[PDB]
Design a protein around this ligand. Structure first.
Ligand SMILES: [Ca+2]
Ligand SMILES: [Ca+2]
Length: 159
C-alpha cells in the first residue's frame, strides 16, 4: 500500500501532495487556467470502496472548479462520474471573483462536522464504487482563474 500521489495534470503545481494529505487546511494550486478536456489525476495508492467523495476549498476561494466532473476509476480505462460541478458551459469573466458558494458548493456547516465552517465543498455520496484513481475532468474552459484543491477527501477521511 502506497501514499496517494499525483500521476497527471494539465499544468504545474505548488505541491500536489497537499490535495491528498488528509489536512483540509493545506492546499495545492495548479498554476494555470483550465481548458475543456484538461485533467488533474491522483493515484489513491490502493483500491478503495469509495462511498463518499468531497472536494474541499476555502469558502472564499476564487480558484475553485466552475465546470467539471470529479470521476473515479479502478483501471485507468473507464472513468465513472462521482461529482458534477456546474453546467458544462464556460462561465463569464463576471464570475471571476465569485466564491464557491455562487457555483453550487455546500458550506462547511452542512457537513455534520466533517468540513470546517470556513470552507466549501462539493460531494458525491452513497457512491458504491471501487476505485484506485480519482480525477478532475474540466468540461469547459475558464480562462480567468486557476485551480486550487484543499482536499480530495475519501470516505470522510476514515481509516
Ligand atoms: Ca490538504
Ligand atoms: Ca458553467
Amino acid at each position: 500500500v502506497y501514499e496517494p500521489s499525483l500521476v497527471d495534470a494539465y499544468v504545474g503545481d505548488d505541491g500536489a501532495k497537499k490535495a491528498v494529505d488528509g489536512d483540509l487546511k493545506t492546499r495545492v494550486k495548479f498554476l494555470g487556467a483550465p481548458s475543456t478536456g484538461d485533467t488533474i489525476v491522483y493515484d489513491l495508492g490502493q483500491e478503495i470502496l469509495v462511498d463518499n467523495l468531497k472536494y474541499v476549498v476555502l469558502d472564499t476561494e476564487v480558484d475553485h472548479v466552475r465546470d467539471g466532473k470529479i470521476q473515479l476509476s479502478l483501471d485507468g480505462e473507464t472513468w465513472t462520474d462521482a461529482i458534477n460541478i456546474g453546467d458544462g458551459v464556460e462561465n463569464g469573466v463576471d464570475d471571476m471573483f465569485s466564491t464557491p458558494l455562487k457555483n453550487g458548493y455546500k458550506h462547511g456547516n452542512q457537513s455534520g462536522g466533517i468540513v470546517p465552517i470556513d470552507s466549501a465543498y462539493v460531494e458525491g455520496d452513497n457512491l458504491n464504487q471501487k476505485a484506485r484513481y480519482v480525477r478532475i475532468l474540466f468540461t469547459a474552459p475558464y480562462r480567468h482563474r486557476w485551480t486550487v484543491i484543499n482536499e480530495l477527501m475519501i470516505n470522510n477521511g476514515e481509516y
